[PDB]
Amino acid sequence: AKSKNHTTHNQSRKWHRNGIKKPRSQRYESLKGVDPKFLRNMRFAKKHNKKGLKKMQANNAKAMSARA
RNA sequence: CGGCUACCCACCCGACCCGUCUUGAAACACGGACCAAGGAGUCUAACACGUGCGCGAGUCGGGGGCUCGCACGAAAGCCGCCGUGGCGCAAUGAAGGUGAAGGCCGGCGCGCUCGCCGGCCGAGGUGGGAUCCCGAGGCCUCUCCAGUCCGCCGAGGGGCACCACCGGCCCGUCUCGCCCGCCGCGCCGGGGAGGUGGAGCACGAGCGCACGUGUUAGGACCCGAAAGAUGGUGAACUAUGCCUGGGCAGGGCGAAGCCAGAGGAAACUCUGGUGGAGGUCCGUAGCGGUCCUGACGUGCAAAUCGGUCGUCCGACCUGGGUAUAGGGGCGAAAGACUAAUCGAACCAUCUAGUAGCUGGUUCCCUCCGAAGUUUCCCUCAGGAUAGCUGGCGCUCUCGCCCACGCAGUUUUAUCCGGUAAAGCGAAUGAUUAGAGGUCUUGGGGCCGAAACGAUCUCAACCUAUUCUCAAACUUUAAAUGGGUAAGAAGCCCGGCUCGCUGGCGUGGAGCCGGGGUGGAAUGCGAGUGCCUAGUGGGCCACUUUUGGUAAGCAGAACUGGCGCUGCGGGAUGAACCGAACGCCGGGUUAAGGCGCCCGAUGCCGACGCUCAUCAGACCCCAGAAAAGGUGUUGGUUGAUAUAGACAGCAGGACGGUGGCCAUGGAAGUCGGAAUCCGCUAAGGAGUGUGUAACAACUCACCUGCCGAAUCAACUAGCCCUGAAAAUGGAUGGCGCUGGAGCGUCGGGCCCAUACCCGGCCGUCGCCGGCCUACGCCGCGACGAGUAGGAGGGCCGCUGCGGUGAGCCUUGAAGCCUAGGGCGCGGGCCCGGGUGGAGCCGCCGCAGGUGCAGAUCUUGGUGGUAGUAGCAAAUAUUCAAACGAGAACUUUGAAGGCCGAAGUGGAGAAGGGUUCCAUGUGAACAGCAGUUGAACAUGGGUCAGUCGGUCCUGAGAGAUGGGCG
RNA sequence: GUACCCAUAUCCGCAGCAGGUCUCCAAGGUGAACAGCCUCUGGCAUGUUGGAACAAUGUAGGUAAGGGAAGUCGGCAAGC
RNA sequence: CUGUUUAAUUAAAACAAAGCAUCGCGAAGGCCCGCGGCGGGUGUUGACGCGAUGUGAUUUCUGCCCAGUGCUCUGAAUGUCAAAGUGAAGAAAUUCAAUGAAGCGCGGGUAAACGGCGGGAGUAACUAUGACUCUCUUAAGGUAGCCAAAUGCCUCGUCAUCUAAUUAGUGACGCGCAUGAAUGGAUGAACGAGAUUCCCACUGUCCCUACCUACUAUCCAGCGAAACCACAGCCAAGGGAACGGGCUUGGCGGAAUCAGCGGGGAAAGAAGACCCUGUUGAGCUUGACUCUAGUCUGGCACGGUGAAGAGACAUGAGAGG
RNA sequence: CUUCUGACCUUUUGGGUUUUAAGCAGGAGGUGUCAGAAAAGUUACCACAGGGAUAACUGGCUUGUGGCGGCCAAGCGUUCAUAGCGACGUCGCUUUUUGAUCCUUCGAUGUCGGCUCUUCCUAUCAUUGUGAAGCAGAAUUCGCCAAGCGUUGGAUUGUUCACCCACUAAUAGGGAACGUGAGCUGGGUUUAGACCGUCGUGAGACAGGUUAGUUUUACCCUACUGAUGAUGUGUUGUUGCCAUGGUAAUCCUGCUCAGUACGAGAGGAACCGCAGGUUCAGACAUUUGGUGUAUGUGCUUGGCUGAGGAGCCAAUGGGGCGAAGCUACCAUCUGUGGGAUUAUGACUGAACGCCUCUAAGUCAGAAUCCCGCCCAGGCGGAACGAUACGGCAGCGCCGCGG
Ligand SMILES: [Mg+2]
Ligand SMILES: [Mg+2]
Ligand SMILES: [Mg+2]
Ligand SMILES: [Mg+2]
Ligand SMILES: [Mg+2]
Ligand SMILES: [Mg+2]
Ligand SMILES: [Mg+2]
Ligand SMILES: [Mg+2]
Ligand SMILES: [Mg+2]
Ligand SMILES: [Mg+2]
Ligand SMILES: [Mg+2]
Ligand SMILES: [Mg+2]
Ligand SMILES: [Mg+2]
Ligand SMILES: [Mg+2]
Ligand SMILES: [Mg+2]
Ligand SMILES: [Mg+2]
Ligand SMILES: [Mg+2]
Ligand SMILES: [Mg+2]
Ligand SMILES: [Mg+2]
Ligand SMILES: [Mg+2]
Ligand SMILES: [Mg+2]
Ligand SMILES: [Mg+2]
Ligand SMILES: [Mg+2]
Ligand SMILES: [Mg+2]
Ligand SMILES: [Mg+2]
Ligand SMILES: [Mg+2]
Ligand SMILES: [Mg+2]
Ligand SMILES: [Mg+2]
Ligand SMILES: [Mg+2]
Ligand SMILES: [Mg+2]
Ligand SMILES: [Mg+2]
Ligand SMILES: [Mg+2]
Ligand SMILES: [Mg+2]
Ligand SMILES: [Mg+2]
Ligand SMILES: [Mg+2]
Ligand SMILES: [Mg+2]
Ligand SMILES: [Mg+2]
Ligand SMILES: [Mg+2]
Ligand SMILES: [Mg+2]
Ligand SMILES: [Mg+2]
Ligand SMILES: [Mg+2]
Ligand SMILES: [Mg+2]
Ligand SMILES: [Mg+2]
Ligand SMILES: [Mg+2]
Ligand SMILES: [Mg+2]
Ligand SMILES: [Mg+2]
Ligand SMILES: [Mg+2]
Ligand SMILES: [Mg+2]
Ligand SMILES: [Mg+2]
Ligand SMILES: [Mg+2]
Ligand SMILES: [Mg+2]
Ligand SMILES: [Mg+2]
Ligand SMILES: [Mg+2]
Ligand SMILES: [Mg+2]
Ligand SMILES: [Mg+2]
Ligand SMILES: [Mg+2]
Ligand SMILES: [Mg+2]
Ligand SMILES: [Mg+2]
Ligand SMILES: [Mg+2]
Ligand SMILES: [Mg+2]
Ligand SMILES: [Mg+2]
Ligand SMILES: [Mg+2]
Ligand SMILES: [Mg+2]
Ligand SMILES: [Mg+2]
Ligand SMILES: [Mg+2]
Ligand SMILES: [Mg+2]
Ligand SMILES: [Mg+2]
Ligand SMILES: [Mg+2]
Ligand SMILES: [Mg+2]
Ligand SMILES: [Mg+2]
Ligand SMILES: [Mg+2]
Ligand SMILES: [Mg+2]
Ligand SMILES: [Mg+2]
Ligand SMILES: [Mg+2]
Ligand SMILES: [Mg+2]
Ligand SMILES: [Mg+2]
Ligand SMILES: [Mg+2]
Ligand SMILES: [Mg+2]
Ligand SMILES: [Mg+2]
Ligand SMILES: [Mg+2]
Ligand SMILES: [Mg+2]
Ligand SMILES: [Mg+2]
Ligand SMILES: [Mg+2]
Ligand SMILES: [Mg+2]
Ligand SMILES: [Mg+2]
Ligand SMILES: [Mg+2]
Ligand SMILES: [Mg+2]
Ligand SMILES: [Mg+2]
Ligand SMILES: [Mg+2]
Ligand SMILES: [Mg+2]
Ligand SMILES: [Mg+2]
Ligand SMILES: [Mg+2]
Ligand SMILES: [Mg+2]
Ligand SMILES: [Mg+2]
Ligand SMILES: [Mg+2]
Ligand SMILES: [Mg+2]
Ligand SMILES: [Mg+2]
Ligand SMILES: [Mg+2]
Ligand SMILES: [Mg+2]
Ligand SMILES: [Mg+2]
Ligand SMILES: [Mg+2]
Ligand SMILES: [Mg+2]
Ligand SMILES: [Mg+2]
Ligand SMILES: [Mg+2]
Ligand SMILES: [Mg+2]
Ligand SMILES: [Mg+2]
Ligand SMILES: [Mg+2]
Ligand SMILES: [Mg+2]
Ligand SMILES: [Mg+2]
Ligand SMILES: [Mg+2]
Ligand SMILES: [Mg+2]
Ligand SMILES: [Mg+2]
Ligand SMILES: [Mg+2]
Ligand SMILES: [Mg+2]
Ligand SMILES: [Mg+2]
Ligand SMILES: [Mg+2]
Ligand SMILES: [Mg+2]
Ligand SMILES: [Mg+2]
Ligand SMILES: [Mg+2]
Ligand SMILES: [Mg+2]
Ligand SMILES: [Mg+2]
Ligand SMILES: [Mg+2]
Ligand SMILES: [Mg+2]
Ligand SMILES: [Mg+2]
Ligand SMILES: [Mg+2]
Ligand SMILES: [Mg+2]
Ligand SMILES: [Mg+2]
Ligand SMILES: [Mg+2]
Ligand SMILES: [Mg+2]
Ligand SMILES: [Mg+2]
Ligand SMILES: [Mg+2]
Ligand SMILES: [Mg+2]
Ligand SMILES: [Mg+2]
Ligand SMILES: [Mg+2]
Ligand SMILES: [Mg+2]
Ligand SMILES: [Mg+2]
Ligand SMILES: [Mg+2]
């Protein structure tokens, strides 16, 4: 009652029935896995960007609109 | 005259019998004699998904109540202070419990890696994002002027659905830190900043109804078992006890006891009768069954018969009553018997037990369409998961110098490898041979008391070489192959934030604003979500390989095919070569072929090879080698020949020297070593034959005649030998030799469902029109397919509600039909005939809804087939009679059998009118009948003294009592 | 209760089935015998069919010149 | 020995048998039945009886081992050993400690209980064979007997006899794979429908077949089924699921039949009795797992009165190293 | 599930305290069949559902192995390789042994051997014709054409195989599903009974040994043997051909040749001719032997017809003979030759001045082959005869018109 054990015949033809797909697109890539000390940098940097970017960038926009 | 047609026949070509298990079916695999009816995926509950409807942060009366007593009303209508309740709107924790809003501006405490007060907005931001809005500008018969008008658009803005990321809030644990409050200051509560797990929030989409698919539990697609339990029925067969009865022909052997006689001293012994003993011998009835493995062996019989048998006074055979009843009984023990069943009886119930295991599974058309593979399982005939597949969609993109993106592809750059190869005078492992050198010990020899005092030889070592390799060696290193990049998600500039880092505004990440998109080739319109069947036994072929001697063997890699697949060649074929399939007309071709089958060379085809007394005839493919050929055709290497060869004829073939090693010979001639000179025309210290040797013969060599080409060794094309198998046979056969064989080719010719054009059907994509919009057109590309999945059916059957002022006793359903027709098809309509009372079309609804199979169930009917068979036991014959009718009925007569253990006269059990008479002969008696045990009618059984009734036998049994 | 069968045709075996089922009575001859054979009383039509011929093969019975087990696993069967 | 046995494949070398023995039991008992009772069989019985066993007449015999598995007896002398009871800790549940019935072990017996019975080397005036002797080892080491047997793989062992010829028979030899003593050994008159070899007579078993009779088979009168059947039946070769009838290429092929014969139809009769698979069973067996009837014990109630003796705990006094 | 560790943790159900219990998080106790059930054996008394997914027969591929050939030749063969052989190597054939695979067969293909019977192959044992020897003759050995015909009786074993005796020209090798069981036999293998020896505690097992152990059916089709018949010639009869199918003859002994050739002897032929004999085939019964129911004759046993005579029955009562018929290698007769040729030996004669059996031509040439002889004669054809009264008929030749 010996049977055929293992083969990879008729496998690439099944693979190319659907055109094997790259993930091909991740705009603004996934962030998990990166260094937790770098995350402790980046989250506080982002929320203080939300806090204190207003007036200096506003005056810089006024200055660059006056210059050009 | 015309007619396709379920009519019949002939002709050319193709054509194995369907269904399934299978890699493979026409199979020497299985089911199927034929026909009619029935026959197999239903229903409930639960879940999930998709679709349609109503209401919608709600939804639902399914539970009851209200109406007057209504056939349809077991319907329907309503409740609302009947919403109790289910699901959802809130999750997280094991739990105590806790529980989803933030952002902007101004002020203060040292705007402190830090909390508070006042006002405003309100489910955040980034990049995409259908759509929408604004708009420079352009364009409509001659000028200024205009309003709607014809009319797009660079660029800009707000940004649904969803995608990707960041940030925020809730709960539980973890880390670090400070503050607040007091119906009471405590091992009391709450709050902050980070990293976490959750099926969460971040403007909610559910509930109910119905349909479709899938899964699960239920008998559950249909049929199927060996088995288990529960409760009853059997000792009329058989097994064994017990009671009660019955039976067993004749002979042979001759025990105990008894009588008489004889011998002896006694003890005692011997002889002739008599007697009838015995789990005794031959043998009958009876009981069993050894052998012929006889006859049957669809028989007389689901165990019998004929011979030959064993035993037959007994451990003998047997009737009736009774007792032992199923995991029990009984067993002179065979697991044998227990009602044709016994290694656990029979009947019913659980039960339609379960089966991963055989078989079957019912209308058509269209579209798409596999796999025998990964992993896991007490897994290997199975299942789960992933892959392959189908269906349902959603998000976008195009139609009006440039788009988003993708690829079994190439190129341009960039890396990666360790196989093929090659090498080992390169590491490792093997392995061959020679040379040189002198350090060293081991064995021989010389100078010689001995001495590395000197030297010859040998071994090992070293040096430079050289021979051959290595899947588990490698300096080097291919071809093929794999990854990445070829832009707006990319560059450049300027600036903020950081609690990361730190000489530094140093670096790095994030955030904000702006500038220019023409950045390899070719082709293609893309992304994404849900549900699910089948599959999980494979095989073959080129190339690379593992094991094996090899296999149509077993196991791997890439690709293709079969499976799942037709068609043209290979005669015949699963895989080979072409080439893939809707129905046809024309033309062309591939693979192949052109002597006849058999379409096409029947060309004044070309070149050359081949004789077989076993020719040869085209990948897989259906047979063959080493070796050999003065059989022929080329080719290479050479050597001879006018200073006349090759073959032919003729002549010579000596001297030293009978040399040397030998003596059984050698005086060239078995053998061992050699090898010259003279005469020369030339002789080889001799190529062979012999006479044992001594001698004759012959050859190399030489010369006379002849006359110009000759000889040798290899090589490869055809052919031959090598080449032997059983049924008679295979280039397919027939035949084929100036080819119809072989190798090279030229021009034509033939066709497949292949290709091009055209007609028709269908599917798909795009689209047209304000003509059943679910209809009507238009263009273009394609149609194959088992398992499986969808869509359509104005295919069909049954019944239900609407509906056709439907149909008809002037003929409905059903059935038959060499008739007419439609649709590709499921099927349908009409014509003709039997028939006599119900039937149909459309729209919705619900099925016990379609048959070729299942050793399918029931019923009927063929071939066999007027066949086998009416043959165990000796046998009938003549005349007459009743009678339509006599081999069979009856009588006379003749001949036989049973022959007293009967083929006779009567009984017990069992049968129940079969007993008797009359009448009929369809029915039964396996032919027949006037006959019978058949049929119909009418009769027949008389008891104090025959038996039961009475009695107990083995035993069965109730009360008293005990147990339950 | 009293008929009848009590059986190769009235029972059982699916049947007018070479199967099975318990008993009494028993003649003459030959013969030891209730053995086998032929007769008597008493029954019967040969056992679910008849006619014609006598082929192969078969089923039962009998023989065969000479050898006597040489055949066959075995003297199996048959015969003394 | 006579007898019995697998009805429907065995008739025996199988079973039974008398004889030989063994064990349990003196009745409140042995062996058993029963769901139950002091219910029943043995038992209308009492060791010359009942029940369970091995072997199987007569003669001669009954070798040696209790190491193992069994069976039995004994001592609370001593380890282990469950309920119930005693004491201590605590508020109690609970925990701990000693006390220790059966059984196991410790000790003895038993083999006419289950069973078992050795392999090495050197040795005698030719060679061999080899009593004797050394050594490992067990519990004992096969004794009296017997043999290529119904028991011997090699093996058709060797020798002798029967025959012309023998894998057959008979007799002997015996380190005998793997004979053997109630697992009974060795003989053994009579009897085997038991198995085998040889001899005389006898015959068709044959050489070597032939003939005759009865019945059937043949035909006719009457009456007449059954199995089986996808279709139906001419062969050779090739291919194919590797042996076809139907495919291909050849050989070819006349209607309808009768009597036979068995080459074929991989003929029919049965869902292979052989092999394997099933997470399918069933008879069994035991030192497989898990239970239980029965049975041996301890405790608790029925279960009560009197005396004597002993053990342990607690109290006080005296001796004691 | 158990155990341990940690929080001054949660719940211990109406409220508090304590013990206990449960939970939370992580370490261990283990699933070796290692992603994990807790598990001995037998069934020859076996059963069920399946499988040729999977063995035991054949058949199919291969030929390791077996068997049978070839190649070069160191040597054996007194000398001498190839008369006969041939070491070491090497190339092949076959499925007559065995092995390998599982392709078919599990809803069955009846599995060994023997008997009987038919056909085929040659790798030839003998016979016919041949060549070569270390072939003097005789007897052998090696090859070729060659399968036409033969290739025994027996003691043993179930035997296949194997050994032995005797005869003979010789006792050659095989195939046909390891030919053949709806042909037989059942001897063993291979059911159930049982015994011995070994293993196992035991049920039981033993390619260890010995006994007893059911062999079912043809009437279907085809094939084959035999017998009717069918088609066209108008019917029918007689006399005849053979196209085709088959094939039949084989072998040995004795006498002359001849005690001759040959050989020193020992020994010892051949050709023709003559008597025969073995096997096979066809017959036939005059004789012989069988059979015998002309139930023919004649005895005799037991019974029966009253006794004699005549008889009858006893499954043809017995046996003595026995006519006709069937039969026996148990009696007797018969079995027949022409051609082309294979192997081989040659002639003439080149290639290649010569040689040569060959390349074209020729000759001889055998159990091989074909034909004759002999069997049945074709969907084959001939020649000839009669060819339908009766009282009306009916039927043929010539030439006819519709
Ligand atoms: Mg597989
Ligand atoms: Mg398939
Ligand atoms: Mg198969
Ligand atoms: Mg098929
Ligand atoms: Mg079959
Ligand atoms: Mg079939
Ligand atoms: Mg069938
Ligand atoms: Mg139907
Ligand atoms: Mg929904
Ligand atoms: Mg509520
Ligand atoms: Mg059970
Ligand atoms: Mg019961
Ligand atoms: Mg009785
Ligand atoms: Mg008995
Ligand atoms: Mg007696
Ligand atoms: Mg006697
Ligand atoms: Mg006797
Ligand atoms: Mg009997
Ligand atoms: Mg009998
Ligand atoms: Mg018989
Ligand atoms: Mg018969
Ligand atoms: Mg008798
Ligand atoms: Mg007798
Ligand atoms: Mg007797
Ligand atoms: Mg027995
Ligand atoms: Mg038994
Ligand atoms: Mg029975
Ligand atoms: Mg059983
Ligand atoms: Mg039972
Ligand atoms: Mg069912
Ligand atoms: Mg069932
Ligand atoms: Mg698996
Ligand atoms: Mg299957
Ligand atoms: Mg799946
Ligand atoms: Mg999809
Ligand atoms: Mg799709
Ligand atoms: Mg290499
Ligand atoms: Mg499905
Ligand atoms: Mg393979
Ligand atoms: Mg294909
Ligand atoms: Mg495909
Ligand atoms: Mg073709
Ligand atoms: Mg071909
Ligand atoms: Mg065309
Ligand atoms: Mg071509
Ligand atoms: Mg043509
Ligand atoms: Mg040549
Ligand atoms: Mg050749
Ligand atoms: Mg030919
Ligand atoms: Mg050519
Ligand atoms: Mg299609
Ligand atoms: Mg009516
Ligand atoms: Mg209709
Ligand atoms: Mg139905
Ligand atoms: Mg209905
Ligand atoms: Mg039907
Ligand atoms: Mg079907
Ligand atoms: Mg049927
Ligand atoms: Mg029927
Ligand atoms: Mg009816
Ligand atoms: Mg019929
Ligand atoms: Mg008849
Ligand atoms: Mg009869
Ligand atoms: Mg009359
Ligand atoms: Mg009259
Ligand atoms: Mg009669
Ligand atoms: Mg009588
Ligand atoms: Mg009557
Ligand atoms: Mg009748
Ligand atoms: Mg009458
Ligand atoms: Mg009546
Ligand atoms: Mg009176
Ligand atoms: Mg009375
Ligand atoms: Mg009672
Ligand atoms: Mg009472
Ligand atoms: Mg009476
Ligand atoms: Mg009777
Ligand atoms: Mg009778
Ligand atoms: Mg008398
Ligand atoms: Mg007398
Ligand atoms: Mg009497
Ligand atoms: Mg009768
Ligand atoms: Mg005789
Ligand atoms: Mg005689
Ligand atoms: Mg004699
Ligand atoms: Mg004799
Ligand atoms: Mg014999
Ligand atoms: Mg006899
Ligand atoms: Mg006689
Ligand atoms: Mg018997
Ligand atoms: Mg005795
Ligand atoms: Mg007692
Ligand atoms: Mg003893
Ligand atoms: Mg002891
Ligand atoms: Mg000595
Ligand atoms: Mg001894
Ligand atoms: Mg003998
Ligand atoms: Mg022994
Ligand atoms: Mg012993
Ligand atoms: Mg014919
Ligand atoms: Mg054929
Ligand atoms: Mg093939
Ligand atoms: Mg074949
Ligand atoms: Mg064939
Ligand atoms: Mg067939
Ligand atoms: Mg045909
Ligand atoms: Mg075909
Ligand atoms: Mg016939
Ligand atoms: Mg027959
Ligand atoms: Mg059969
Ligand atoms: Mg089966
Ligand atoms: Mg399994
Ligand atoms: Mg079991
Ligand atoms: Mg596992
Ligand atoms: Mg047996
Ligand atoms: Mg070989
Ligand atoms: Mg197979
Ligand atoms: Mg096989
Ligand atoms: Mg395979
Ligand atoms: Mg057969
Ligand atoms: Mg022949
Ligand atoms: Mg065979
Ligand atoms: Mg036998
Ligand atoms: Mg036997
Ligand atoms: Mg034992
Ligand atoms: Mg017997
Ligand atoms: Mg007949
Ligand atoms: Mg002829
Ligand atoms: Mg003859
Ligand atoms: Mg005579
Ligand atoms: Mg007389
Ligand atoms: Mg007289
Ligand atoms: Mg008489
Ligand atoms: Mg008589
Ligand atoms: Mg007579
Ligand atoms: Mg006579
Ligand atoms: Mg010649």
Side-chain angles (χ1 to χ4, degrees):
Chain A
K2 186 183 286 185
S3 65
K4 185 175 176 66
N5 291 314
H6 174 75
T7 185
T8 60
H9 179 73
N10 197 0
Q11 294 296 318
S12 178
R13 189 176 65 85
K14 292 195 290 184
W15 293 348
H16 295 92
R17 296 293 298 274
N18 291 318
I20 299 298
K21 291 184 262 74
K22 189 181 287 184
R24 55 76 61 83
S25 66
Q26 295 294 321
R27 300 182 70 186
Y28 291 164
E29 290 286 332
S30 66
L31 192 273
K32 66 184 289 184
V34 182
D35 196 2
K37 188 178 289 293
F38 186 76
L39 185 63
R40 291 179 186 269
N41 190 3
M42 188 181 73
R43 291 187 180 182
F44 287 94
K46 285 181 179 180
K47 74 178 186 181
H48 290 89
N49 280 315
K50 184 175 73 175
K51 181 176 174 66
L53 187 272
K54 188 268 298 294
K55 60 181 181 293
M56 294 179 184
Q57 184 65 42
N59 289 116
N60 206 169
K62 291 181 181 180
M64 69 180 290
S65 66
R67 290 178 66 187

